[PDB]
Amino acid sequence: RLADQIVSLSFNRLQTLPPGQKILRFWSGFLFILHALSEKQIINSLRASIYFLALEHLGTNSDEALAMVLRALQELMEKSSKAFWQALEQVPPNQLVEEIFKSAAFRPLLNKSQVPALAAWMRALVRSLPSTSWSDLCETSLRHLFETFRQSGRATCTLAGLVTLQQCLDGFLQQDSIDTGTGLIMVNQLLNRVVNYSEIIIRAASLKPGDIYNVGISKAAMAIIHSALALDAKATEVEWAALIAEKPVQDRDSGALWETFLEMLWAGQLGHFELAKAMLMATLRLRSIEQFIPKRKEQLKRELDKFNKRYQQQTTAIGKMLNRLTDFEPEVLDKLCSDQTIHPIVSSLIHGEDAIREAGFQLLKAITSESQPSDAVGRMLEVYFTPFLNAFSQAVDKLTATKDANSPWSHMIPILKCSDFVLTGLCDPSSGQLRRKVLTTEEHAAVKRWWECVWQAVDHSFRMMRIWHIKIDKKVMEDFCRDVMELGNKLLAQDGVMASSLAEDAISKAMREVLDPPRKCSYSLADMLQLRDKYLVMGIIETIKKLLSRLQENEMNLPQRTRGHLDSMLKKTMDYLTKTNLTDVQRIELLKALGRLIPPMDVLHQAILEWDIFHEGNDPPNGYRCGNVSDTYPDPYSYKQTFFPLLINEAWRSFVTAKDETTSKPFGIKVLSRMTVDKFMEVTAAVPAQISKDRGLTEGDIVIISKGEDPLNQPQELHCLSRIWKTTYKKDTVEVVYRLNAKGNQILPALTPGSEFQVVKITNMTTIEREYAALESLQYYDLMDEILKAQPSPMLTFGDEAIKAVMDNYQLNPGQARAILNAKENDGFTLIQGPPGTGKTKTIVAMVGCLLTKLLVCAPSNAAVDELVLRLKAGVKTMNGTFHKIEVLRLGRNAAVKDVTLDELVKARMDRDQLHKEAGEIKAKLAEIRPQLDAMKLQREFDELKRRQAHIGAKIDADKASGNTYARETEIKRRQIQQEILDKAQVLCATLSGSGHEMFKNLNVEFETVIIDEAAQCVELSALIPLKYGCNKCILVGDPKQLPPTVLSYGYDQSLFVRMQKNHPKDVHLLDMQYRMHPEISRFPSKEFYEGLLQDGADMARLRLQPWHQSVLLGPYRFFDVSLVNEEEVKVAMQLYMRFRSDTGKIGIITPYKAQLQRLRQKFVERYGESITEQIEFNTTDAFQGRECEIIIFSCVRASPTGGIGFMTDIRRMNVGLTRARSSLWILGDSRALVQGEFWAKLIEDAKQRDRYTNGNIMALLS
């Protein structure tokens, strides 16, 4: 019946067009039957033609009938397409579409046509066909919809053509793999059809929404643009991943395709936010693809060159895309960043291609408006903490996961720079985000993930050097290795911040999770010590030592492969298994730290900073008792146990004595970041430049902290001590990181960001730290037994002709020649003891001419060093009568010494606008072009003027980054200039503390013989400093006296000389003569100090005859009787000098205290001008040691109390001040404030019992 009605309606039998009512009735019946039937039943029964009769009936002249055959054919091909294309294999889809579309009744179906039926019909048509027939159909069908048929019908066919292109692009974009054979060329044909039909898509997407002709045109065109821009990137990625594996591809235009949809519009259209997001994910699709670099011996192939040109065009277009995005307003920009669209921007920051990286860094600068890269990254970490710290970790981790020969290289240079940017935006001690806020659950994970990511990137950069060294130059690899080493150092320097931010119990828990990423990058570190570079080995050694010390501190282990590689490298097995160029210092340093150096100083800081300075006792508040000197310590550790409280007590007495006479003004600090980092309450502040320059704020400088208005005399307030820990010279204001003590700090509740304090300074730790270093590293000296047992070299006697022979060489004495010859003969410690006028410095100078026929000569004050330098420079005579001249060097920091100073000798051998003009000029063109814009020709200019502003701004930032290269190469020249100077010099002179500098560990020095002058006027741990450098012969010369017998029999500072003198007094070269002092100036401090044994020189009364002693009041000796100021002595000294002037280098005025020294200098400079600063030497007793003048004016303030702080030092002060003159000594002071002291009372009694007293009004008595 169905076939009989088909035969009735067939054009084969009837040979005529049937009436349209029968046609529509028949196809409505077919629709009812097909709704009743099933697809499997259609394939089984209906397929076994009705389809050909449908094609014949599709040519009727009725609009309704043509609509029913179209709806029918849609239902047939949708319900089962396999039978549809099996039963119609004779007719192609081309002829199907042409036969349907050439019908004369189809035009009013279009005209009389919430999508229309034809759009869904063509969706079913495209989905019903295989991929291989997609292209040829399109070559008709789109050409028939867009062009041949071209207004509701025109809008309908335009919508239809957009639907075809969208359906084909979505079909190709949803595939799991595009094959390299026919698949790539049909994708290429579709993309060429998209490029050809681009203008119609542009006018389609430019339509206004809500229009009567917009039936879905704009959304379809937008989806077409999105899918085309995704498919271009996917095709390029597929082609790259094919030709990098040496596979056949085939023998497109991505730049033009990106450029067309760029140049359509981006501001001033609907959905520009969505277009920008789609373009950003499209450029995220291809973020780890790099151009091809040929090998050194090989050449580039043809296909790789063609791919390089194509990739050049594509990356230029992508860079123009990213540069165009910096015209949006900040509101939509921060909406785009905050909102999965930040990942392409952050990945563009890393990229190795120049255009994409420059465009991304400009976009990052434009979003936050912080016009600097590190400031931009800091502001991004401030606003978007977890999105940015996740995007950076993902973008870096995506590229450092595989180590092969196809690994990218140009991406590894700007990974380190961005890691440095994040680190100095995250851990700065004033602008650090980790010093300001507490961390929640998500931020902890973000910071942890960034830590693991950056250490993995450093490990990947170090590991694959060998596979990279076959295709690049030598200089880029050397500079790359140096940069990676410096980044590793900067990364490992900041682990305490992570431990005390990512958490006393949880501190160790957080620290244990910080040191796990550095353990992975350990074998890579212990492989770069084999190179022939001299700068890299220093940094690798430092990083290995710091990592191993921190790992052994917190209780863990090193990887076994790193230890095995280090073990098979520095041990003899007789040669080494791996040839190195290491020295003998690095080998010892490693072979130790692994299992003569500088120890840590972190318990000393807490022991001195847990103190209250206003304690009224004579002992420290903590438990530190002393008074035990056993003189025969047979062990270094018992020596350490004895001499550590002997160091703490000395520091306490120095602190109190410096609190008495501080002479420093206070300054105010404001807290910038409070944080319990590295166990101490490390507070930071920004001190102005003028205060830091005026007060000399260096590291190791000790200050007070108080809330009081005058922190030196308010003990009732809230206060503590601090040590300056790190000083950084910023632009103007110095950044100072004070360290505190959070174990009883009274200001600790009052500590708050924004709390202005008042701070005054006391002393420096440098000598105490050097004494600690000498105490701890005494265990590796070569003079162990002589230091511990206090045994000098034995005494022995010479013949009576060589003594006269050496006496007749330097014109010496029988006391000063036997010592010369004995110290020439034997080795070890030789002791020479004399009062302050014998000639001990004269003996030492003749020793140098005796020994040199290099040397280190040391003295505990600077004045004795200056005297030794001048005497050793003036003239040297050998042991033949010959006048030679040796080379002199000063290892310190006077006028004549300034020409032989090591700091001056090293320094003497040592001695942007174009880019700024381009950036200012290029910014002027952007202002004119943008206001003129708000068309095609203009947009090419505004895209090419703005790329040079990206290019110049990259060159401006690269100018600042080049300063690190100039700063490093300055340092290797300094270590080589220093080492040359240290070998040309014949004699070298320094202080006891200055010779133990930290800079002599990395240099090559060996001083086999040390000479110490004034060895008995210093603490015992000071003379143990310049003995580390292989010294095996030391000569100790000094003065074991300067204390009276009632005071000689404290114990915290005696000497090294005094212990040996009390242990072995039989072998000490005594010098009993004197050769400067008049018999009065030699007769009173004799009987006070030297028990009538200091005998005067031959006929010295006649030698000391200068006129002035013609007056009894102005003789060689006369005592004058008049809060460490005492202006009365200032007026009396002024009157005495005025009297002597009324009646060059021979007049000196001496005060024992710094405040009266300041008053003396102020008053004298006042009315006697500035010429008396050099005429009369104004210095204390601590700056006048070892020297002499003809006339001296001594003015002491007042006697310290007997049981109080001081006393011993004031007695030593008085005895230094008394015996500095050769002709005249004039002592001043009042009687009432001086009779409290015992020895001043003995002095004033000796003054009366020999007519040496002047009392009453001196000012009337002088006139």
Ligand SMILES: Nc1ncnc2c1ncn2[C@@H]1O[C@H](COP(=O)(O)OP(=O)(O)O)[C@@H](O)[C@H]1O
């Ligand atoms: N044998 C000598 N003959 C002549 N003068 C001497 C002799 N020995 C020392 N002097 C003088 O004695 C003074 C001692 O000064 P110096 O040696 O610098 O201090 P000290 O004796 O404390 O080491 C020198 O000025 C020197 O001129």
